[PDB]
Amino acid sequence: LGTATGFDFELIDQAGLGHEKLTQARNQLLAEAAKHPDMLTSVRPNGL
Amino acid sequence: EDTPQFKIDIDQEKAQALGVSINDINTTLGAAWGGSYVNDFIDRGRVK
Amino acid sequence: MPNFFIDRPIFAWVIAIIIMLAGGLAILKLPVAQYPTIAPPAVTISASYPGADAKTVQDTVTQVIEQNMNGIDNLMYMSSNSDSTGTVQITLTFESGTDADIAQVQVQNKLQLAMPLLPQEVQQQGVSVEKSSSSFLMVVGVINTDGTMTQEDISDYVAANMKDAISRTSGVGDVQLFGSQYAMRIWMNPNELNKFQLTPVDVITAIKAQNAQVAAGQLGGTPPVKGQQLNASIIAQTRLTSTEEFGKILLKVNQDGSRVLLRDVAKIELGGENYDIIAEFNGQPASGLGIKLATGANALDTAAAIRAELAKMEPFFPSGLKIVYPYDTTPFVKISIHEVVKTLVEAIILVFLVMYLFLQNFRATLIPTIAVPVVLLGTFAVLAAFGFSINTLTMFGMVLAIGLLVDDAIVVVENVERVMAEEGLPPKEATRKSMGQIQGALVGIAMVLSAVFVPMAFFGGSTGAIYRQFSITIVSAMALSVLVALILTPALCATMLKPIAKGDHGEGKKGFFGWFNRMFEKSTHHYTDSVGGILRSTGRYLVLYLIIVVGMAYLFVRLPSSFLPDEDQGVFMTMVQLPAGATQERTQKVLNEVTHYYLTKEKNNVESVFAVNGFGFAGRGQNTGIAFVSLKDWADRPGEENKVEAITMRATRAFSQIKDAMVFAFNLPAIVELGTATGFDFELIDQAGLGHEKLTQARNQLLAEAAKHPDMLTSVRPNGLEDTPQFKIDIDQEKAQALGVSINDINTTLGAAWGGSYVNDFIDRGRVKKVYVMSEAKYRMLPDDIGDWYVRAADGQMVPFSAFSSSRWEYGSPRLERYNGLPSMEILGQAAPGKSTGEAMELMEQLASKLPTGVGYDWTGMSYQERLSGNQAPSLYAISLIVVFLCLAALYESWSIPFSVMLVVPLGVIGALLAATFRGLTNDVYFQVGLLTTIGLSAKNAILIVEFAKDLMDKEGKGLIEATLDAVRMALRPILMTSLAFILGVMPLVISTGAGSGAQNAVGTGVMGGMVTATVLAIFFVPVFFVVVRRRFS
Amino acid sequence: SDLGKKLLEAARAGRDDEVRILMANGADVNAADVVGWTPLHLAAYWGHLEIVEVLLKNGADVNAYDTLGSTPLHLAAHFGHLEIVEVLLKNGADVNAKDDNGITPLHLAANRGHLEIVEVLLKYGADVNAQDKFGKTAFDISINNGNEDLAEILQ
């Protein structure tokens, strides 16, 4: 159940786009989440 | 029901006399008429 | 509840019928086997490396598997041994109550993942994971009398024809072939191979090419050219099927054009996979099938079905082939069941006689005749419900129950007959009152007897499993007897019995019964006068009690102890160990003498001798062998002179004369599954990588120190083999590379010729079988033959093995043991006469502490079980003793009075110990259960006397002595009736000389002797106990 | 013989008291198992110094050879039994004894790198230039094993 009021999210490659396209899609979501400090906090990847 | 079968006999004595290895005969015959699974490849980011 | 069913007799019959049908149903569905699952779940990993030494097997297979045996649940310990036959066996023993299927699949799964780490030769042969803890139902022997078939010829037939059919038979759970099916044996010749400049490398390469299944394809296969009409599969080269085809295998074509075939450079025949074991049945070639019983199957139905299937095969056997049964365990199960029915039939017959002797009316003799069978059938229903089976232990459990089932029947009926004779009430009113006196007591007795036997089932390991069979059977039988005593027999008594006039004691009759009634009435007044005099001087009888209690303790300590009694099983073994380096032929000559002795000097005892050359339990090799002696029926061997123990002693002494061989006979354990279970099992562990040689020196040291204590330790020897001379050959790498000879071709030519090589498979009459290449005997015997083998160099020149090799003699292990991953050496031994096994372990631990640094130890098998069992015993006795008190304390409404009942325990134990000590028996399970039952009924007798005595004081306001004298008078008849019937009931068990007598003797002796004292003493001591206790406390 | 097989076991196990009793009863000291190993061969192998001396006192063959030509000195030198090597050599052990391979006690000693034993063998006149069936000397073994200490001794 982990942290109290936190979430574990998974961004999936459905069309077989590629790692490069998925990293860009991740960055777009990370950047759009940074525009919402009022709701979302410490949104980051668990990978390298 | 019982099916007709095409029995093919490789004369290994004749093969040796002509200088042909039985491995190359078995592979040629095997790969040609039956097919042969060589290795895998990546098709749009999936092993096939 | 008794009142409820006295007014509702048909309801009481319905419950009795419901119980009967449940029992009758249970009897049909109940599993039937000699013994239940005693030994803890054990999974054995078996692998094979053809032509490999113990160290090659250990360092490439055993160690690799051991390291991967992780993530497996409920493992107690792991043990393995690697021997010079090229065999390894890793046994993983699990916690008792572990699912054997889950245990095996978890072991199997970890092996599968470790398979790619093993040698290619071991992966070819494969690695078997089997439940080894299971035992054999019977061993079917297959022989050839007209000498037309070898053991290989017989083995192949059984495998190809008989095995699958027996495996399919109803109730069969496992079938192991005692031998192997045919293999295509290529017996290579080095002189012929060198003549044509060929090697075993060429022979192997050629077989792999010309004996193979080649994939081709299809005509008109998909995707096709549209318009195609026919689609046919293409068949190419398939496997060879005959010795002829293998003979025509081409190896070389010469310059002149002449062809070199496999038959030119080798002998080609169908033979065995290995020739290590030679099996003979009365000197004739033999194979066989080891058949195990399936889970829940009926042993008697299974064996009958196996014989039925073999009977249908009989018309299709080749001439000379015969079926023989050297080992069969069903005769025990059939006799164990028959003697149970016989006992309980005689028990009902005996009650009838004693009931009519005292009560003298057939109406009263039929109440026990109905009640006893009802409770027995009831037990079978509870037995089935708890997942128990009909076995020796559960069957003798019911024989030991009858004394307590019969008692309930007599006590109820007798008490009603007395009340009618004394007060003159009608049967219905008499039963209501009679039950009112005993109903609270019987419920109290039920709770006490539970507290005696139930805790005994909560022992752990092997001993706990054995005790649980007796515990549940007796507690179930006891429990149902009380329900039938509070439901049926009250209803029967109220309806079936005939009224007795007030003061009618049968003294008005004539003949025998008129005389008997006068005698007994006079004897009762004589007895009550004796108690009156005993109670005037309680002081001296308290002294006499302490002498019995001290006398009890004395005998209990001096009585030799042993888990189970040695039984004449109609089978025993003769171990044959020859010196280090001794050959197969030399061991056969000794086995022939053993076979000759048993068929000559024991012609009237021995049926057959199964001579197995090459196999031993303590290790394998050409220098070991065992002869399995199969005896005639017990009825065709009268007296102790014609018994296993007598013959064992005669054989041991007879074979003492034989030179260069350690030959001796010995009986099998009571439970083959469990093992020896007499002595200790010690493991000596290398904890700091000391090595084999250093672990040998530390072992010799421990053995030497054990020999200096004959007073404590006896027969303390190693279980494994000793180091033997082995032919070390050093291949010069420089010389090999110089002459242009590869190491692969050198190590293949050596390994293939001398060791043998499993090349590939071929199909013999629609059966896939192995192809082995190996040197013909005469070219792989002596070190001179090493030089006769040639290997081709790159330049095509044939170089002899002597050119690039050097040899010497060294010593090495032909059997390397490992315990829990670390190198070990198993040491067996036992406590000296008079000494306990526990004391012997204490010293072995002390001696082990003074061994060199890095040398550890551990307790395995029976030793591991004994220690964890010994820890439980104190806590269980305490629980058992506390609850007995608490139950009696509630029954009598007193903290003090319970002691009067609990003081009778030694009165029954002294008689049992006197009987056992006199007859020369041991403190075994059957005896120990015999004590608990003797204590049970002796307590039951006392409980009723104390209850009656107390109730008379409480209700009618009688004095202590008045009530006690009145109580013993009323209690005399039913005590004598119960004792008389039960002592006569266990008479056949004591005097039994034939089959399963060791069990019956242990059962009967302790019970009969105990009952005699428990009867004679209690009637005089119970009144003393109650009086002495009552006087002290208030 | 009976006692011959008991002495073979006694000599191997290293039971000095049993060997003593066997020498008194007259156990065959020239007794040999299937491979041709005498009690002295075994005593030398398993490193039982006291029994080697007792056996030699009772006329045991010091230059006894097995079915492959190896002597007790070969075994004593190979397995690094300095005390036993000296006793054997004092009692007239062939220092240059060749097995069927042409291997000597010096070769075997040099191979396992027993520096003390090598110098004892050379003291009693070991042929340092002795060649086995491959033409290898104790020196050729020393440089191949990479034993700098042993290399210096053989110069």
Ligand SMILES: CCCCCCCCCCCCO[C@@H]1O[C@H](CO)[C@@H](O[C@H]2O[C@H](CO)[C@@H](O)[C@H](O)[C@H]2O)[C@H](O)[C@H]1O
């Ligand atoms: C009909 C009514 C009677 C019901 C009977 C109920 C049966 C009792 C259930 C428990 C059975 C197991 O019994 C249990 O054994 C373990 C040992 O394994 C004991 O544990 C023991 O540990 C160590 C072992 O050296 C002892 O020093 C210690 O005195 C003891 O506590 C428990 O104290 C005991 O409760």
Ligand SMILES: CCCCCCCCCCCCO[C@@H]1O[C@H](CO)[C@@H](O[C@H]2O[C@H](CO)[C@@H](O)[C@H](O)[C@H]2O)[C@H](O)[C@H]1O
């Ligand atoms: C050890 C062998 C097995 C025997 C087990 C012991 C119990 C059975 C023995 C027989 C019991 C009967 O023996 C009984 O002894 C007592 C001794 O106080 C006698 O009592 C005797 O002393 C009392 C006073 O103390 C007198 O009042 C009485 O007149 C006198 O006979 C009883 O009259 C006799 O009947």
